[PDB]
CSV table of C-alpha atoms and ligand atoms in Angstrom, one decimal:
chain,number,residue,atom,x,y,z
A,1,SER,CA,-0.2,-0.1,0.1
A,2,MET,CA,0.9,3.8,-0.3
A,3,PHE,CA,0.5,3.9,3.8
A,4,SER,CA,2.9,0.6,4.1
A,5,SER,CA,5.3,2.3,1.6
A,6,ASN,CA,5.1,5.9,3.2
A,7,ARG,CA,5.8,4.1,6.5
A,8,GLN,CA,8.8,2.6,5.9
A,9,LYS,CA,10.3,5.9,4.4
A,10,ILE,CA,9.7,7.4,7.8
A,11,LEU,CA,11.2,4.6,9.4
A,12,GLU,CA,14.5,4.7,7.4
A,13,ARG,CA,14.5,8.8,7.3
A,14,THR,CA,14.3,9.1,11.0
A,15,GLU,CA,16.7,6.3,11.4
A,16,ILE,CA,19.3,8.6,9.4
A,17,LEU,CA,18.7,11.2,11.6
A,18,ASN,CA,18.5,9.4,15.1
A,19,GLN,CA,22.1,7.7,13.8
A,20,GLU,CA,23.5,11.2,13.2
A,21,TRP,CA,22.0,12.5,16.7
A,22,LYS,CA,23.2,9.4,18.5
A,23,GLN,CA,27.0,10.5,17.0
A,24,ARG,CA,26.3,13.9,18.5
A,25,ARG,CA,27.4,14.9,22.4
A,26,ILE,CA,25.1,18.3,23.1
A,27,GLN,CA,26.2,20.1,26.2
A,28,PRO,CA,23.3,20.3,28.9
A,29,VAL,CA,21.1,23.3,29.2
B,1,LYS,CA,-6.5,1.1,17.1
B,2,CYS,CA,-4.5,3.7,19.3
B,3,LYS,CA,-2.4,2.6,22.2
B,4,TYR,CA,-1.0,6.1,23.4
B,5,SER,CA,-2.7,7.1,26.9
B,6,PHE,CA,-1.4,10.1,28.7
B,7,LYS,CA,-2.0,11.7,32.3
B,8,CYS,CA,-2.2,15.5,33.3
B,9,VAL,CA,0.8,15.6,35.9
B,10,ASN,CA,1.4,19.3,36.1
B,11,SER,CA,0.5,22.8,35.1
B,12,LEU,CA,1.8,26.2,35.7
B,13,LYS,CA,0.7,29.6,34.8
B,14,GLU,CA,3.6,32.2,33.8
B,15,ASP,CA,3.7,35.6,35.7
B,16,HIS,CA,3.3,38.0,32.6
B,17,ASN,CA,-0.3,36.7,32.2
B,18,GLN,CA,0.0,36.9,28.4
B,19,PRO,CA,-0.7,34.2,25.7
B,20,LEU,CA,2.0,31.8,24.9
B,21,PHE,CA,2.3,31.3,21.4
B,22,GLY,CA,5.0,28.4,21.3
B,23,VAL,CA,6.7,25.4,22.7
B,24,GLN,CA,9.3,23.4,21.9
B,25,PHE,CA,11.5,20.5,23.6
B,26,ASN,CA,15.0,20.4,22.6
B,27,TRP,CA,15.5,17.3,20.4
B,28,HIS,CA,19.5,17.9,20.1
B,29,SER,CA,20.2,17.0,23.7
B,30,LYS,CA,22.0,13.8,24.2
B,31,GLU,CA,20.1,10.5,25.6
B,32,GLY,CA,20.2,10.8,29.4
B,33,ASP,CA,21.0,14.6,29.4
B,34,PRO,CA,17.5,16.7,31.2
B,35,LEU,CA,14.7,17.2,29.1
B,36,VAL,CA,14.8,21.1,28.4
B,37,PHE,CA,11.6,22.9,26.5
B,38,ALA,CA,11.4,26.6,25.8
B,39,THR,CA,8.3,28.8,25.7
B,40,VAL,CA,7.4,31.8,23.9
B,41,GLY,CA,4.9,34.6,24.7
B,42,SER,CA,4.7,38.5,24.9
B,43,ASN,CA,8.6,39.6,24.7
B,44,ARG,CA,9.7,36.5,26.9
B,45,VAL,CA,11.4,33.0,26.5
B,46,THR,CA,11.5,30.9,29.0
B,47,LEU,CA,13.4,27.4,29.7
B,48,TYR,CA,11.8,24.9,31.6
B,49,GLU,CA,13.4,21.3,33.0
B,50,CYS,CA,11.1,18.3,33.2
B,51,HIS,CA,11.9,16.0,36.4
B,52,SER,CA,10.3,12.9,38.1
B,53,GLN,CA,6.9,13.4,39.7
B,54,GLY,CA,5.7,15.8,36.6
B,55,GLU,CA,7.9,18.4,38.3
B,56,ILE,CA,8.7,21.5,36.1
B,57,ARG,CA,11.7,23.3,37.1
B,58,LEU,CA,11.9,26.8,36.0
B,59,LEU,CA,15.9,27.1,34.6
B,60,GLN,CA,16.3,30.7,32.9
B,61,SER,CA,14.1,33.5,31.6
B,62,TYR,CA,15.1,35.8,28.7
B,63,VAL,CA,13.2,39.1,28.5
B,64,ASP,CA,13.7,41.0,25.2
B,65,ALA,CA,15.0,45.0,25.4
B,66,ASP,CA,12.2,46.1,23.1
B,67,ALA,CA,8.5,45.8,25.4
B,68,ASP,CA,6.8,45.7,22.2
B,69,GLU,CA,7.9,42.2,20.8
B,70,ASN,CA,5.6,39.5,20.8
B,71,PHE,CA,7.3,36.5,20.1
B,72,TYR,CA,5.5,33.8,18.1
B,73,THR,CA,8.0,31.0,17.8
B,74,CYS,CA,11.2,29.4,18.8
B,75,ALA,CA,13.4,26.7,17.2
B,76,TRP,CA,16.6,24.9,19.0
B,77,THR,CA,19.8,24.3,17.4
B,78,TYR,CA,23.4,23.6,18.4
B,79,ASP,CA,26.5,25.4,17.3
B,80,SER,CA,28.2,23.1,14.8
B,81,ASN,CA,31.8,23.8,16.5
B,82,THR,CA,31.1,24.0,20.0
B,83,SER,CA,28.4,21.4,20.1
B,84,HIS,CA,26.7,24.2,22.7
B,85,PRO,CA,22.9,24.5,22.0
B,86,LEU,CA,21.1,27.4,20.7
B,87,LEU,CA,17.8,28.9,20.6
B,88,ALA,CA,16.1,31.0,17.5
B,89,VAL,CA,13.1,33.5,18.6
B,90,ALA,CA,11.0,35.7,16.7
B,91,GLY,CA,7.6,37.5,16.4
B,92,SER,CA,6.0,40.6,15.6
B,93,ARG,CA,9.2,42.8,15.0
B,94,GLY,CA,10.4,40.7,12.5
B,95,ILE,CA,13.7,40.3,14.0
B,96,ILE,CA,15.4,36.7,14.8
B,97,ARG,CA,17.5,36.5,18.0
B,98,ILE,CA,19.7,33.6,18.5
B,99,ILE,CA,19.9,32.9,22.1
B,100,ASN,CA,22.3,31.1,24.4
B,101,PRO,CA,19.9,29.3,26.2
B,102,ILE,CA,22.5,28.7,29.3
B,103,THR,CA,23.2,32.4,29.6
B,104,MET,CA,20.1,33.8,28.2
B,105,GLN,CA,22.2,36.0,26.2
B,106,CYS,CA,21.2,37.7,22.8
B,107,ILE,CA,24.6,36.1,20.9
B,108,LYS,CA,23.4,37.5,17.4
B,109,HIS,CA,20.1,38.8,15.6
B,110,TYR,CA,18.9,39.0,11.8
B,111,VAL,CA,17.0,42.0,10.5
B,112,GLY,CA,15.7,42.0,6.8
B,113,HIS,CA,11.9,40.5,7.1
B,114,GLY,CA,9.8,43.6,6.0
B,115,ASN,CA,7.1,42.5,8.5
B,116,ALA,CA,6.5,39.7,11.5
B,117,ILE,CA,7.9,36.2,11.6
B,118,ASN,CA,5.4,33.4,12.0
B,119,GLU,CA,7.7,30.4,12.0
B,120,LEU,CA,11.5,29.5,12.3
B,121,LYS,CA,12.6,26.2,11.4
B,122,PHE,CA,16.1,24.7,11.8
B,123,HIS,CA,17.6,22.2,8.6
B,124,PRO,CA,17.3,18.5,10.0
B,125,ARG,CA,21.3,17.7,8.7
B,126,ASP,CA,22.6,21.2,9.1
B,127,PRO,CA,22.5,23.2,12.4
B,128,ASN,CA,23.4,26.2,10.4
B,129,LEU,CA,20.3,26.4,8.0
B,130,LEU,CA,17.5,28.4,9.6
B,131,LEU,CA,14.3,29.1,7.7
B,132,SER,CA,12.0,32.0,8.7
B,133,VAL,CA,8.2,32.4,7.3
B,134,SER,CA,7.0,36.0,7.2
B,135,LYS,CA,4.0,38.1,6.8
B,136,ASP,CA,5.8,40.1,4.0
B,137,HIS,CA,5.1,37.0,1.6
B,138,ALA,CA,8.5,35.6,1.7
B,139,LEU,CA,10.1,32.7,3.2
B,140,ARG,CA,14.1,33.3,3.8
B,141,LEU,CA,16.8,30.7,4.5
B,142,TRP,CA,19.9,31.8,6.4
B,143,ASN,CA,23.4,30.6,7.3
B,144,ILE,CA,23.8,31.5,10.7
B,145,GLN,CA,27.4,30.6,10.9
B,146,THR,CA,28.5,33.1,8.1
B,147,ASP,CA,25.7,35.1,9.1
B,148,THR,CA,24.3,35.6,5.4
B,149,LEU,CA,20.9,35.8,3.7
B,150,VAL,CA,21.4,32.3,1.4
B,151,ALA,CA,17.8,32.7,0.0
B,152,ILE,CA,14.5,34.7,-0.3
B,153,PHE,CA,11.4,32.2,-1.6
B,154,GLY,CA,8.8,34.6,-3.2
B,155,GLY,CA,8.2,37.1,-5.9
B,156,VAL,CA,6.6,36.4,-9.3
B,157,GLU,CA,5.3,33.0,-8.3
B,158,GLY,CA,5.7,33.0,-4.5
B,159,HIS,CA,2.9,33.5,-1.8
B,160,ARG,CA,0.6,36.5,-2.6
B,161,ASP,CA,-0.3,37.2,1.3
B,162,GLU,CA,1.4,36.3,4.7
B,163,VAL,CA,3.2,33.0,5.1
B,164,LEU,CA,2.0,31.2,8.0
B,165,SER,CA,4.2,28.0,8.3
B,166,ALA,CA,6.6,25.7,6.3
B,167,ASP,CA,8.5,22.7,7.3
B,168,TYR,CA,11.7,20.6,5.6
B,169,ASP,CA,11.0,17.2,4.7
B,170,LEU,CA,12.6,14.3,7.1
B,171,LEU,CA,16.3,15.0,5.1
B,172,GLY,CA,16.2,18.4,4.1
B,173,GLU,CA,15.9,18.1,0.5
B,174,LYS,CA,12.4,20.5,0.2
B,175,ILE,CA,10.5,22.9,2.1
B,176,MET,CA,6.6,23.0,1.8
B,177,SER,CA,5.2,26.5,2.9
B,178,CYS,CA,1.8,27.8,3.3
B,179,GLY,CA,-0.2,31.1,4.0
B,180,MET,CA,-3.3,33.2,3.7
B,181,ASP,CA,-3.5,33.1,0.0
B,182,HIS,CA,-4.8,29.6,0.7
B,183,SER,CA,-2.1,27.9,-1.1
B,184,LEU,CA,0.6,25.3,-0.4
B,185,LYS,CA,3.7,25.7,-2.2
B,186,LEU,CA,6.7,23.4,-2.8
B,187,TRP,CA,10.6,24.6,-2.9
B,188,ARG,CA,13.3,22.3,-3.4
B,189,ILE,CA,16.7,23.0,-2.2
B,190,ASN,CA,18.2,20.0,-3.0
B,191,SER,CA,18.4,21.4,-6.7
B,192,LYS,CA,21.9,22.4,-8.1
B,193,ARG,CA,21.1,26.2,-7.9
B,194,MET,CA,20.2,25.8,-4.1
B,195,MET,CA,22.9,23.5,-3.1
B,196,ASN,CA,25.7,25.9,-4.8
B,197,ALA,CA,24.0,28.7,-3.1
B,198,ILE,CA,24.5,27.0,0.3
B,199,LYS,CA,28.2,26.1,-0.4
B,200,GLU,CA,28.8,29.7,-1.5
B,201,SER,CA,27.5,30.8,1.9
B,202,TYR,CA,29.8,29.0,3.6
B,203,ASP,CA,32.8,30.0,1.5
B,204,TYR,CA,31.7,33.8,2.3
B,205,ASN,CA,34.4,35.9,4.2
B,206,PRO,CA,33.9,39.4,5.0
B,207,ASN,CA,37.5,40.0,6.3
B,208,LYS,CA,38.4,38.6,2.9
B,209,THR,CA,36.3,40.6,0.8
B,210,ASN,CA,34.7,43.8,0.5
B,211,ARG,CA,31.5,43.0,-1.6
B,212,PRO,CA,28.6,41.7,0.8
B,213,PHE,CA,26.9,38.2,0.1
B,214,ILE,CA,24.4,37.9,-3.0
B,215,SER,CA,21.5,36.0,-1.8
B,216,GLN,CA,19.5,33.6,-4.6
B,217,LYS,CA,15.9,35.4,-5.1
B,218,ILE,CA,13.7,31.9,-5.8
B,219,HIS,CA,10.5,33.2,-7.6
B,220,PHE,CA,9.1,30.1,-9.0
B,221,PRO,CA,8.4,27.3,-6.5
B,222,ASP,CA,8.5,23.4,-7.7
B,223,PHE,CA,4.9,23.0,-7.1
B,224,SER,CA,1.7,24.9,-6.1
B,225,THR,CA,-1.8,24.0,-5.4
B,226,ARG,CA,-4.7,26.1,-3.9
B,227,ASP,CA,-6.9,22.9,-4.3
B,228,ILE,CA,-6.3,21.7,-0.5
B,229,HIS,CA,-8.3,24.0,1.3
B,230,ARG,CA,-10.9,26.9,0.7
B,231,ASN,CA,-9.3,29.2,3.3
B,232,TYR,CA,-6.1,30.5,5.1
B,233,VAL,CA,-3.3,27.6,5.5
B,234,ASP,CA,-1.8,28.3,8.9
B,235,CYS,CA,0.1,24.9,9.8
B,236,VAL,CA,1.9,22.2,7.3
B,237,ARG,CA,4.3,19.7,7.9
B,238,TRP,CA,5.7,16.7,6.2
B,239,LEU,CA,4.6,12.7,6.7
B,240,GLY,CA,6.7,11.2,4.9
B,241,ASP,CA,6.3,12.0,1.3
B,242,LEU,CA,3.0,13.2,2.1
B,243,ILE,CA,1.6,16.5,3.5
B,244,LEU,CA,-0.6,17.2,6.3
B,245,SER,CA,-1.9,20.7,6.4
B,246,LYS,CA,-4.8,22.4,8.2
B,247,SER,CA,-7.2,25.5,7.9
B,248,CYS,CA,-10.5,26.5,9.7
B,249,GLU,CA,-12.4,23.6,8.7
B,250,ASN,CA,-11.8,21.4,12.1
B,251,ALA,CA,-9.8,18.8,10.0
B,252,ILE,CA,-6.1,18.0,9.2
B,253,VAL,CA,-6.4,17.2,5.4
B,254,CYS,CA,-3.3,14.5,4.4
B,255,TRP,CA,-2.4,14.9,0.8
B,256,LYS,CA,0.1,14.9,-1.7
B,257,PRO,CA,1.1,16.7,-4.7
B,258,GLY,CA,0.1,14.9,-8.0
B,259,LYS,CA,-1.7,11.9,-8.8
B,260,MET,CA,-2.0,9.0,-6.1
B,261,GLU,CA,1.3,7.0,-8.0
B,262,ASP,CA,3.1,10.0,-8.8
B,263,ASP,CA,6.8,10.2,-7.2
B,264,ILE,CA,7.7,13.5,-5.0
B,265,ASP,CA,10.9,13.8,-6.5
B,266,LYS,CA,9.2,13.4,-10.2
B,267,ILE,CA,6.4,16.1,-10.0
B,268,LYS,CA,6.9,18.7,-12.4
B,269,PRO,CA,6.4,22.3,-11.2
B,270,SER,CA,3.5,22.9,-13.6
B,271,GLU,CA,1.7,19.9,-11.9
B,272,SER,CA,-2.0,20.7,-11.7
B,273,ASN,CA,-3.2,17.9,-10.0
B,274,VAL,CA,-3.3,17.1,-5.8
B,275,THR,CA,-4.3,13.5,-4.1
B,276,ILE,CA,-6.2,13.8,-0.7
B,277,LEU,CA,-5.7,10.6,1.3
B,278,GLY,CA,-7.5,11.4,4.1
B,279,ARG,CA,-8.4,13.5,7.1
B,280,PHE,CA,-8.1,14.1,11.0
B,281,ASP,CA,-11.0,15.3,12.4
B,282,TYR,CA,-11.7,17.6,15.6
B,283,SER,CA,-13.5,20.3,16.6
B,284,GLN,CA,-13.5,24.1,17.9
B,285,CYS,CA,-10.5,24.7,16.3
B,286,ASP,CA,-11.6,27.3,13.6
B,287,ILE,CA,-9.6,30.5,15.0
B,288,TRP,CA,-6.1,31.4,13.3
B,289,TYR,CA,-2.8,30.5,15.1
B,290,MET,CA,-3.3,26.9,16.1
B,291,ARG,CA,-0.5,24.7,15.2
B,292,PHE,CA,-0.1,21.0,15.2
B,293,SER,CA,2.9,18.7,16.0
B,294,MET,CA,4.4,15.3,15.9
B,295,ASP,CA,7.2,13.4,17.9
B,296,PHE,CA,10.2,12.7,16.3
B,297,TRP,CA,9.1,9.1,15.0
B,298,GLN,CA,6.3,10.7,13.5
B,299,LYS,CA,4.1,8.1,15.2
B,300,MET,CA,1.8,10.4,17.1
B,301,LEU,CA,0.1,13.8,15.7
B,302,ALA,CA,-1.2,16.4,18.4
B,303,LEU,CA,-3.6,19.4,18.2
B,304,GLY,CA,-5.0,21.6,20.7
B,305,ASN,CA,-8.6,23.3,20.3
B,306,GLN,CA,-9.9,26.8,21.3
B,307,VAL,CA,-11.2,25.5,24.4
B,308,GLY,CA,-8.4,23.7,26.1
B,309,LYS,CA,-8.7,20.0,24.4
B,310,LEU,CA,-5.5,18.2,23.2
B,311,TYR,CA,-6.4,16.0,20.2
B,312,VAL,CA,-4.0,13.2,19.9
B,313,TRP,CA,-3.9,10.4,17.1
B,314,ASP,CA,-1.8,7.4,16.1
B,315,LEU,CA,0.0,7.7,12.9
B,316,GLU,CA,0.3,3.9,12.6
B,317,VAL,CA,-3.5,3.2,12.2
B,318,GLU,CA,-3.9,3.7,8.4
B,319,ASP,CA,-7.6,4.9,8.6
B,320,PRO,CA,-7.4,8.5,10.4
B,321,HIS,CA,-10.7,7.8,12.0
B,322,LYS,CA,-9.9,4.4,14.0
B,323,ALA,CA,-6.7,6.8,14.8
B,324,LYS,CA,-7.9,9.2,17.0
B,325,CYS,CA,-6.9,8.3,20.5
B,326,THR,CA,-8.7,9.4,24.2
B,327,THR,CA,-8.7,13.3,23.9
B,328,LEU,CA,-6.6,14.8,26.5
B,329,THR,CA,-8.8,16.9,28.9
B,330,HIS,CA,-8.3,18.3,32.0
B,331,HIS,CA,-11.6,20.3,33.7
B,332,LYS,CA,-8.9,23.0,34.6
B,333,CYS,CA,-7.5,23.7,31.0
B,334,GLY,CA,-10.1,25.9,29.3
B,335,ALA,CA,-7.9,28.5,27.4
B,336,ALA,CA,-6.9,28.0,23.6
B,337,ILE,CA,-3.9,25.4,23.2
B,338,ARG,CA,-1.6,27.4,20.7
B,339,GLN,CA,0.8,24.8,20.4
B,340,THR,CA,2.0,21.4,21.8
B,341,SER,CA,5.6,19.8,22.0
B,342,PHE,CA,6.5,16.1,22.6
B,343,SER,CA,9.9,15.2,24.3
B,344,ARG,CA,12.2,13.3,21.8
B,345,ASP,CA,11.6,9.9,23.5
B,346,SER,CA,7.6,11.1,23.5
B,347,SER,CA,7.2,10.4,27.0
B,348,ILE,CA,6.1,13.9,27.5
B,349,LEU,CA,3.6,16.1,26.0
B,350,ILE,CA,3.9,19.8,26.7
B,351,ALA,CA,0.9,22.3,25.9
B,352,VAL,CA,0.7,26.2,25.8
B,353,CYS,CA,-2.1,28.9,26.3
B,354,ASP,CA,-3.7,32.2,26.0
B,355,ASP,CA,-4.2,32.1,29.9
B,356,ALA,CA,0.1,31.8,30.1
B,357,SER,CA,-0.4,28.5,31.4
B,358,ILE,CA,1.8,25.0,30.5
B,359,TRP,CA,0.2,21.9,30.8
B,360,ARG,CA,2.3,18.5,31.4
B,361,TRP,CA,1.0,15.0,29.9
B,362,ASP,CA,3.1,12.0,30.9
B,363,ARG,CA,2.8,9.1,28.7
B,364,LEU,CA,1.5,5.9,30.4
C,401,LIG,N1,0.6,31.1,17.7
C,401,LIG,C1,0.7,32.3,17.1
C,401,LIG,C2,0.5,33.2,16.9
C,401,LIG,C3,-0.7,34.4,17.4
C,401,LIG,C4,-0.9,35.8,17.0
C,401,LIG,C5,-0.1,36.3,15.8
C,401,LIG,N2,-0.3,37.3,15.0
C,401,LIG,N3,0.3,37.2,14.0
C,401,LIG,C6,1.1,36.1,13.9
C,401,LIG,N4,0.4,35.5,15.2
C,401,LIG,C7,1.2,33.6,15.5
C,401,LIG,N5,1.9,33.5,14.7
C,401,LIG,C8,2.7,32.0,14.9
C,401,LIG,C9,1.9,31.1,13.6
C,401,LIG,C10,1.5,31.4,12.3
C,401,LIG,C11,0.8,30.1,11.9
C,401,LIG,C12,0.5,29.5,13.2
C,401,LIG,O1,0.9,30.2,14.0
């Protein structure tokens, strides 16, 4: 479906952003 | 069916008693770090920390030197060199301020918008690329490292009235904007023209040249439709390759440019068709300037109404009707909910109102 296909796109793309976030160490506020 | 259940654990009312227009958790903070968020209202920016047992700890307050400033929005970033958190705020003045959240000091500001700023958004891959949407009918892209205006999105086929919202897609290849002209416009920023314009802004050196940097003027969008809503479009966000936008119709329309099977990256600028995929219904949200929000993993959608109700939907449910979770109400929460923010891990939902009140809903 369009839904399931759109869902995997979100999964993969949020996973790319999440990995880049994990590699970062932003100082506390 | 929806799984998500929440519990209202705390509330507070800010001293100025003015409406709170925006709220944002800082999603750049590292796993473990205290969950922080900022709220904006009047000429104030206030930081809070979320502790156990629904405790909301006030950290710092920023009061703008200009008493007549009315902040409408904030966005979090980080310095790409020092890893230090940064916060951009803007409103009625049309002046963007970069604040050091730790000291509440205005580090730098950007003038150029001829009218109020409605939205600020930082690029999802580049912490230096800030987009601002204004009442002056344009969107502007800034490189806050080199202090340059990269591009202005408007003109001949740009917005014909105040721009209200915009959103970068997950990877930051394209921006969707929307406004009072009832239209939703697509602006690709991964085009050779724009990718080079971004590089140029990084190469700019004011101590090595006398000529000021030349911004790009993007007069033509890559897609434009006025066929989703019959009135003003005050909020837009990307849902994968689909769009989520709202008007005063008490529904968030889910749509895509072109036909059902058309690829977002193959949509020609002249595309005349638009496919409506569904609708997220609610009520009592016909007033202007009411924004919806999503959690990081785009699994939950939240929107507050004019009477203090917080609607939440499960974006993993295919039909938008059997996706609606129990509405988050509190008999004491009665003013308009302007904006919501989920914490990075989606454990907390904060809501801000016209009566200066903050509301903390913790997931069960
Ligand atoms: N929230 C808010 C807000 C409130 C008053 C107001 N007057 N001019 C612009 N204003 C806002 N702008 C933020 C915005 C734009 C679209 C959705 O919220």
